[PDB]
Amino acid sequence: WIENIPLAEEEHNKWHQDAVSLHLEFGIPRTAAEDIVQQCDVCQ
Amino acid sequence: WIENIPLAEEEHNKWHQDAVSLHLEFGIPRTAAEDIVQQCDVCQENKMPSTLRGSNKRGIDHWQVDYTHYEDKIILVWVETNSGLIYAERVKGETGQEFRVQTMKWYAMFAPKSLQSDNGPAFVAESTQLLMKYLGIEHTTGIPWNPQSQALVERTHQTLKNTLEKLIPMFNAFESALAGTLITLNIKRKGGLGTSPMDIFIFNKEQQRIQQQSKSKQEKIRFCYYRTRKRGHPGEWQGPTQVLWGGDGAIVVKDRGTDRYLVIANKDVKFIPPPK
Amino acid sequence: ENIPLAEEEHNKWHQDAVSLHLEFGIPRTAAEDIVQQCDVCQIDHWQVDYTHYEDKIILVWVETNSGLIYAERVKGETGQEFRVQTMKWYAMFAPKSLQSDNGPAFVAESTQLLMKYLGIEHTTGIPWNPQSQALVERTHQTLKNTLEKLIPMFNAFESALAGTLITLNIKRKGGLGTSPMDIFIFNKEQQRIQQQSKSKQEKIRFCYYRTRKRGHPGEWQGPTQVLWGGDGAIVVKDRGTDRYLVIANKDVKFIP
Amino acid sequence: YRTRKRGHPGEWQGPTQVLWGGDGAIVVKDRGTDRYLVIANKDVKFIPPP
Amino acid sequence: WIENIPLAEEEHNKWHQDAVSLHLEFGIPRTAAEDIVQQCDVCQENKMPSTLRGSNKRGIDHWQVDYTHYEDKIILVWVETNSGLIYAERVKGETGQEFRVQTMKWYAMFAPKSLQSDNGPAFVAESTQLLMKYLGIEHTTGIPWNPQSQALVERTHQTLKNTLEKLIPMFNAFESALAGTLITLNIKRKGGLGTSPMDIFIFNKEQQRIQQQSKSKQEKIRFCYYRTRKRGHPGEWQGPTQVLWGGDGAIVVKDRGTDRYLVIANKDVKFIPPPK
Amino acid sequence: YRTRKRGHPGEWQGPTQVLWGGDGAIVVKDRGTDRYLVIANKDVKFIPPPKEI
Amino acid sequence: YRTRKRGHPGEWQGPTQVLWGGDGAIVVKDRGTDRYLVIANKDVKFIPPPK
DNA sequence: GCTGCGAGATCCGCTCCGGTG
DNA sequence: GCTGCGAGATCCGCTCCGGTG
DNA sequence: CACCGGAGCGGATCTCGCAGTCGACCACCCTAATCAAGTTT
DNA sequence: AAACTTGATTAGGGTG
């Protein structure tokens, strides 16, 4: 989780998927993933 | 706060706190804040196991026992699980042979079908176990450092010893007073609807009569499909199996998948027409 | 209430109170009251014997009706030991009443007292009933026969004693696969339903009563006893017919 | 009967209706939720109404 | 039909049973059938005292303490009642002199106003008591062999020792780890609204201030009256007392009769007009 | 997990895996004896599965 | 499914699996004797699907 | 393959009966 | 002249947001 | 646009340890080191 | 006369 969770935060800035996709990739919290995608200006 | 988190994480790694205070002061979502101490070593280590546990109502004639040392008197105690009618007897030694004889007596008083009992050697003894087996009976093991599986017998050791303290001066015999306590709580203790355990055991022996159960076979079976809705959309009838018993608005059924009895509301039932 | 209709049938046919209970599903102390109140024919009721086997005094307990029993090894036939034994025996059951001979432990003052302490009908006397006595005899014969089967097989005499108690009370069955256990049990059911439902409530009450003719209330009649007060009903004998009747409590005037 | 309760077995519940006898459990309605359920027969205590 | 009762009474005096079975079999009213065992000696004597009890958070600056042996380390623990912020310190001996010094320290850290503490001799010591007195402070006695008045300090001995088991490897010092636990639960434990005890103590010290508290005297008083209904019929008005504070639909008042604060719904109030 | 010797509980041990779950106690393997065991929940200190991994 | 004795149709049995669809009959196991069996489609009543 | 429950004493709410302006 | 509440795991009663016959 | 579902948090439910260091001596059942008693190539 | 198996009587591990 909390080792996955930063790394996915790193990786979304690269690869910009769904929060869904990272929840389902890394097995993180989805809502945190959603927080990244919102806090990711790029998908915004 | 999403990136406050590694610092908050550090502050757990430093200062090792609850998911809450950490959640709030770092102002995050709390749930991964719990996944902290899930992922902590330290705080993961030393927490206690909150665990409720359970005792078994279990079976008609299913039983539970422990020996007693009342006033330096070994008293071995014969105590039902389901409706918790009991028996006991004073004993000179706890030994497996002695024990085996005691249970021969008490077993002969009834058709006790099974048992929970602890790690005491006489319970545990080889020919004791072979005797349960010899008679086609289920011993089960009260386990180390759980009197609590042995709950009721210890409970009743309480109840009984209170009653002893009443009655024993009234008698020549301690063991007639033992009879008196035995009498009373297997009988004279009556409650709810004002019924003993004895009521309930014996009643249920009438209730558990095999001939009646065998007889109900003549009553009709139907089968029924149940099915399951994913995003609103019910599955195939899963399978089709007997309406074990119908209720109003739902039924009794088994999932062979679990091999376990189950409900289906009568809307998600298919009624399956008769042969004809 | 089926009790007065059962009484209607017995007044005709003169059966056993057994089959009155069984036929009509009434109480058995009701039924026993009928046969005792039926001049033509005019539970939890036991008999004991100590018995010697292999130089082992054994106390025995024999229900007079189901025929179900109990027995236990005895050191000596003393009143006091026996007083303990009937503590334990009453422990296993809810016995009402008893027969026995005049045996000293039985007749003894603290023993008879103890029956009274338990509210029991004890009867010592030369036990005279071939109904009972035949069965007690069959019991002891069958019994020590079954000892002679079982006792080699067991570490304990009292375990094999247990064995015979099983054999006869449980494993031994008849009719529809009923052991005297099953009998006894089933009797305790409805009897302890009726006993709670009835005898505890009210005793020795009279009333005036009437009979509705096409729903037209009769004259008030009696005074007669309230024999069994029912739920919304009672039981009464109309003195003229020598027959029992159900009367609804509205057609009752209870005589205070 | 008793079910999940606070955790695992709660405190006892009902008295309810003994509807269908099975092996090891049976279904009784929850008066609270009006809902048919199951109680392990080790979570049961059987009773005659009156 | 209540003349069965003395015999039933005897049957309790003999056979000592529940009010119910006795009630039913003797077929009486049950309630005096309970008054039996109320009046029994035998079935009575031996009953247990069902008693809930209570703890006192008490007023601000009211405190509670016990020593704790942690890993053979005397640690004397300084634990508030009301908002339960705490302190503790490791000690070499429990002694009254040592103790007296410890409390000098901790007392100096605050304005702790009172105490609950047990029968431990150092708590109890003469000059200890004289020291509380010397400073105008209320000791109160944890009674002997009841930790439960000493509740929170034992509770916290739990909490703390869990935290010790975490932290102590992280430090040179056991007592720096003691500082760490101290830190955390007096601070870092934060909950509800995400606040420490430290929050609450200190806050309340701001709210425990005398001047704003004394300033409010300028605000108006009115007095007000009350009466009591016997079989529905209210008494005379039982005098006038200050409306200590008014609420909506009721107020704050004292009965001098009890010398205790009280409510009156504003209908049973007389408002008493001003001087003028 | 831990175990009772004259009642005296063991130290916390392993840790290892939930094999069969039950309410209040489970099945687990003793690594030392390679043997299955039933442990009182009280003496079961729960862990999430992945451990360090 | 049912079975005949001297042509006399036995009582219906199952419901069961159509173990294989045949022409004029099918395959079924007897749950009682644990044996595959064929039943002529007249001695069969097929069961409609969940609808 | 095994699981905490019941007894004791209080405290509040609901029902039936009676008193008050 | 004084009073068991607190730490630790689990779960139902609710809402906010997304998917779709 | 109505209905069901995944994710979220306040509230609710259950079990338990703080009480100084803990063992000392019993009774039962099961397992094991050690000594005594025979033969057999 | 070395080795080979089995019964007897006190010392340790799990349970009231």
Side-chain angles (χ1 to χ4, degrees), chain G residues 17-28 37-41 44 46:
Chain G
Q17 289 174 337
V18 172
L19 294 179
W20 181 78
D23 183 67
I26 58 170
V27 184
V28 296
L37 295 171
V38 171
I39 306 292
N41 293 336
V44 180
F46 295 96

PDB file of all heavy atoms in Angstrom, chain G residues 17-28 37-41 44 46:
ATOM      1  N   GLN G  17     -30.509 -34.319 -14.129  1.00  0.00           N
ATOM      2  CA  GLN G  17     -29.843 -33.812 -15.308  1.00  0.00           C
ATOM      3  C   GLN G  17     -30.300 -34.569 -16.526  1.00  0.00           C
ATOM      4  O   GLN G  17     -30.373 -35.799 -16.518  1.00  0.00           O
ATOM      5  CB  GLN G  17     -28.340 -33.945 -15.174  1.00  0.00           C
ATOM      6  CG  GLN G  17     -27.765 -32.996 -14.185  1.00  0.00           C
ATOM      7  CD  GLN G  17     -26.298 -33.208 -13.938  1.00  0.00           C
ATOM      8  OE1 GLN G  17     -25.761 -34.291 -14.166  1.00  0.00           O
ATOM      9  NE2 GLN G  17     -25.632 -32.159 -13.465  1.00  0.00           N
ATOM     10  N   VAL G  18     -30.530 -33.835 -17.609  1.00  0.00           N
ATOM     11  CA  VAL G  18     -30.478 -34.500 -18.894  1.00  0.00           C
ATOM     12  C   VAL G  18     -28.989 -34.743 -19.079  1.00  0.00           C
ATOM     13  O   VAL G  18     -28.230 -33.815 -19.360  1.00  0.00           O
ATOM     14  CB  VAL G  18     -31.059 -33.643 -20.018  1.00  0.00           C
ATOM     15  CG1 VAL G  18     -30.806 -34.304 -21.363  1.00  0.00           C
ATOM     16  CG2 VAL G  18     -32.552 -33.391 -19.795  1.00  0.00           C
ATOM     17  N   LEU G  19     -28.573 -35.997 -18.940  1.00  0.00           N
ATOM     18  CA  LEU G  19     -27.149 -36.281 -18.986  1.00  0.00           C
ATOM     19  C   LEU G  19     -26.678 -36.316 -20.419  1.00  0.00           C
ATOM     20  O   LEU G  19     -25.535 -35.943 -20.710  1.00  0.00           O
ATOM     21  CB  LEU G  19     -26.836 -37.594 -18.261  1.00  0.00           C
ATOM     22  CG  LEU G  19     -27.052 -37.677 -16.749  1.00  0.00           C
ATOM     23  CD1 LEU G  19     -26.701 -39.057 -16.237  1.00  0.00           C
ATOM     24  CD2 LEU G  19     -26.269 -36.658 -15.975  1.00  0.00           C
ATOM     25  N   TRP G  20     -27.540 -36.765 -21.315  1.00  0.00           N
ATOM     26  CA  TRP G  20     -27.351 -36.480 -22.717  1.00  0.00           C
ATOM     27  C   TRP G  20     -28.699 -36.539 -23.411  1.00  0.00           C
ATOM     28  O   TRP G  20     -29.512 -37.419 -23.119  1.00  0.00           O
ATOM     29  CB  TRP G  20     -26.360 -37.466 -23.313  1.00  0.00           C
ATOM     30  CG  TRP G  20     -26.112 -37.229 -24.722  1.00  0.00           C
ATOM     31  CD1 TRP G  20     -25.324 -36.278 -25.259  1.00  0.00           C
ATOM     32  CD2 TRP G  20     -26.617 -38.000 -25.811  1.00  0.00           C
ATOM     33  NE1 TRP G  20     -25.321 -36.377 -26.626  1.00  0.00           N
ATOM     34  CE2 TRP G  20     -26.110 -37.435 -26.988  1.00  0.00           C
ATOM     35  CE3 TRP G  20     -27.466 -39.097 -25.904  1.00  0.00           C
ATOM     36  CZ2 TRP G  20     -26.417 -37.932 -28.240  1.00  0.00           C
ATOM     37  CZ3 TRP G  20     -27.752 -39.599 -27.141  1.00  0.00           C
ATOM     38  CH2 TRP G  20     -27.255 -38.999 -28.295  1.00  0.00           C
ATOM     39  N   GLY G  21     -28.935 -35.590 -24.312  1.00  0.00           N
ATOM     40  CA  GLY G  21     -30.100 -35.643 -25.166  1.00  0.00           C
ATOM     41  C   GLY G  21     -29.972 -36.700 -26.241  1.00  0.00           C
ATOM     42  O   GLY G  21     -29.051 -36.634 -27.059  1.00  0.00           O
ATOM     43  N   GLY G  22     -30.908 -37.646 -26.278  1.00  0.00           N
ATOM     44  CA  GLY G  22     -31.003 -38.613 -27.339  1.00  0.00           C
ATOM     45  C   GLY G  22     -32.182 -38.365 -28.250  1.00  0.00           C
ATOM     46  O   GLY G  22     -32.813 -37.301 -28.220  1.00  0.00           O
ATOM     47  N   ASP G  23     -32.477 -39.363 -29.078  1.00  0.00           N
ATOM     48  CA  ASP G  23     -33.608 -39.327 -29.991  1.00  0.00           C
ATOM     49  C   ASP G  23     -34.605 -40.358 -29.493  1.00  0.00           C
ATOM     50  O   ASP G  23     -34.341 -41.563 -29.518  1.00  0.00           O
ATOM     51  CB  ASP G  23     -33.162 -39.608 -31.419  1.00  0.00           C
ATOM     52  CG  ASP G  23     -34.291 -39.514 -32.401  1.00  0.00           C
ATOM     53  OD1 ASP G  23     -34.809 -38.396 -32.592  1.00  0.00           O
ATOM     54  OD2 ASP G  23     -34.662 -40.558 -32.974  1.00  0.00           O
ATOM     55  N   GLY G  24     -35.745 -39.875 -29.013  1.00  0.00           N
ATOM     56  CA  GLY G  24     -36.714 -40.708 -28.342  1.00  0.00           C
ATOM     57  C   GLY G  24     -36.447 -40.915 -26.870  1.00  0.00           C
ATOM     58  O   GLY G  24     -37.365 -41.312 -26.143  1.00  0.00           O
ATOM     59  N   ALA G  25     -35.240 -40.620 -26.402  1.00  0.00           N
ATOM     60  CA  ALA G  25     -34.907 -40.761 -24.998  1.00  0.00           C
ATOM     61  C   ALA G  25     -33.728 -39.848 -24.708  1.00  0.00           C
ATOM     62  O   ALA G  25     -33.357 -39.006 -25.529  1.00  0.00           O
ATOM     63  CB  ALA G  25     -34.590 -42.211 -24.646  1.00  0.00           C
ATOM     64  N   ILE G  26     -33.154 -40.017 -23.520  1.00  0.00           N
ATOM     65  CA  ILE G  26     -32.044 -39.211 -23.038  1.00  0.00           C
ATOM     66  C   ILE G  26     -31.200 -40.111 -22.142  1.00  0.00           C
ATOM     67  O   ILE G  26     -31.319 -41.334 -22.180  1.00  0.00           O
ATOM     68  CB  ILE G  26     -32.518 -37.939 -22.294  1.00  0.00           C
ATOM     69  CG1 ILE G  26     -33.420 -38.292 -21.102  1.00  0.00           C
ATOM     70  CG2 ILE G  26     -33.244 -37.009 -23.248  1.00  0.00           C
ATOM     71  CD1 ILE G  26     -33.705 -37.117 -20.218  1.00  0.00           C
ATOM     72  N   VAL G  27     -30.319 -39.493 -21.355  1.00  0.00           N
ATOM     73  CA  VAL G  27     -29.566 -40.188 -20.320  1.00  0.00           C
ATOM     74  C   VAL G  27     -29.881 -39.539 -18.983  1.00  0.00           C
ATOM     75  O   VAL G  27     -30.011 -38.313 -18.890  1.00  0.00           O
ATOM     76  CB  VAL G  27     -28.055 -40.156 -20.589  1.00  0.00           C
ATOM     77  CG1 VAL G  27     -27.308 -40.984 -19.533  1.00  0.00           C
ATOM     78  CG2 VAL G  27     -27.722 -40.610 -21.981  1.00  0.00           C
ATOM     79  N   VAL G  28     -29.991 -40.369 -17.947  1.00  0.00           N
ATOM     80  CA  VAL G  28     -30.153 -39.930 -16.571  1.00  0.00           C
ATOM     81  C   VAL G  28     -29.513 -40.966 -15.671  1.00  0.00           C
ATOM     82  O   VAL G  28     -29.522 -42.164 -15.955  1.00  0.00           O
ATOM     83  CB  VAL G  28     -31.621 -39.747 -16.142  1.00  0.00           C
ATOM     84  CG1 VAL G  28     -32.295 -38.635 -16.939  1.00  0.00           C
ATOM     85  CG2 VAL G  28     -32.374 -41.092 -16.216  1.00  0.00           C
ATOM     86  N   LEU G  37     -28.822 -44.146 -16.854  1.00  0.00           N
ATOM     87  CA  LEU G  37     -30.039 -44.773 -17.334  1.00  0.00           C
ATOM     88  C   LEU G  37     -30.623 -43.963 -18.471  1.00  0.00           C
ATOM     89  O   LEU G  37     -30.380 -42.760 -18.570  1.00  0.00           O
ATOM     90  CB  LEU G  37     -31.071 -44.876 -16.234  1.00  0.00           C
ATOM     91  CG  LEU G  37     -30.768 -45.769 -15.034  1.00  0.00           C
ATOM     92  CD1 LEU G  37     -31.829 -45.516 -14.020  1.00  0.00           C
ATOM     93  CD2 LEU G  37     -30.674 -47.246 -15.401  1.00  0.00           C
ATOM     94  N   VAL G  38     -31.414 -44.631 -19.300  1.00  0.00           N
ATOM     95  CA  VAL G  38     -32.129 -43.999 -20.401  1.00  0.00           C
ATOM     96  C   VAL G  38     -33.612 -44.038 -20.080  1.00  0.00           C
ATOM     97  O   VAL G  38     -34.110 -45.019 -19.516  1.00  0.00           O
ATOM     98  CB  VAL G  38     -31.818 -44.707 -21.732  1.00  0.00           C
ATOM     99  CG1 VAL G  38     -32.708 -44.228 -22.875  1.00  0.00           C
ATOM    100  CG2 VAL G  38     -30.379 -44.461 -22.124  1.00  0.00           C
ATOM    101  N   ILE G  39     -34.318 -42.976 -20.457  1.00  0.00           N
ATOM    102  CA  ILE G  39     -35.748 -42.835 -20.207  1.00  0.00           C
ATOM    103  C   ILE G  39     -36.371 -42.306 -21.485  1.00  0.00           C
ATOM    104  O   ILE G  39     -35.986 -41.234 -21.971  1.00  0.00           O
ATOM    105  CB  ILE G  39     -36.050 -41.890 -19.032  1.00  0.00           C
ATOM    106  CG1 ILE G  39     -35.306 -42.315 -17.750  1.00  0.00           C
ATOM    107  CG2 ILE G  39     -37.579 -41.834 -18.788  1.00  0.00           C
ATOM    108  CD1 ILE G  39     -35.770 -43.619 -17.124  1.00  0.00           C
ATOM    109  N   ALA G  40     -37.338 -43.045 -22.017  1.00  0.00           N
ATOM    110  CA  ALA G  40     -38.036 -42.605 -23.213  1.00  0.00           C
ATOM    111  C   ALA G  40     -38.764 -41.301 -22.943  1.00  0.00           C
ATOM    112  O   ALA G  40     -39.355 -41.116 -21.875  1.00  0.00           O
ATOM    113  CB  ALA G  40     -39.027 -43.664 -23.673  1.00  0.00           C
ATOM    114  N   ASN G  41     -38.762 -40.423 -23.952  1.00  0.00           N
ATOM    115  CA  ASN G  41     -39.169 -39.031 -23.771  1.00  0.00           C
ATOM    116  C   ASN G  41     -40.603 -38.900 -23.272  1.00  0.00           C
ATOM    117  O   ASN G  41     -40.957 -37.885 -22.663  1.00  0.00           O
ATOM    118  CB  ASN G  41     -39.006 -38.277 -25.083  1.00  0.00           C
ATOM    119  CG  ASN G  41     -37.558 -38.145 -25.500  1.00  0.00           C
ATOM    120  OD1 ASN G  41     -36.649 -38.205 -24.672  1.00  0.00           O
ATOM    121  ND2 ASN G  41     -37.334 -37.975 -26.794  1.00  0.00           N
ATOM    122  N   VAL G  44     -40.236 -39.152 -19.831  1.00  0.00           N
ATOM    123  CA  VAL G  44     -39.574 -37.926 -19.423  1.00  0.00           C
ATOM    124  C   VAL G  44     -40.609 -36.818 -19.404  1.00  0.00           C
ATOM    125  O   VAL G  44     -41.579 -36.847 -20.168  1.00  0.00           O
ATOM    126  CB  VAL G  44     -38.440 -37.561 -20.399  1.00  0.00           C
ATOM    127  CG1 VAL G  44     -37.755 -36.297 -19.979  1.00  0.00           C
ATOM    128  CG2 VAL G  44     -37.437 -38.695 -20.514  1.00  0.00           C
ATOM    129  N   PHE G  46     -39.424 -32.928 -19.686  1.00  0.00           N
ATOM    130  CA  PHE G  46     -38.412 -31.892 -19.646  1.00  0.00           C
ATOM    131  C   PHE G  46     -38.910 -30.703 -18.850  1.00  0.00           C
ATOM    132  O   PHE G  46     -40.113 -30.430 -18.792  1.00  0.00           O
ATOM    133  CB  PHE G  46     -38.039 -31.445 -21.047  1.00  0.00           C
ATOM    134  CG  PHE G  46     -37.385 -32.503 -21.858  1.00  0.00           C
ATOM    135  CD1 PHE G  46     -38.126 -33.269 -22.725  1.00  0.00           C
ATOM    136  CD2 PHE G  46     -36.029 -32.732 -21.756  1.00  0.00           C
ATOM    137  CE1 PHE G  46     -37.531 -34.245 -23.483  1.00  0.00           C
ATOM    138  CE2 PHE G  46     -35.422 -33.710 -22.515  1.00  0.00           C
ATOM    139  CZ  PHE G  46     -36.177 -34.468 -23.380  1.00  0.00           C
TER     140      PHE G  46
END
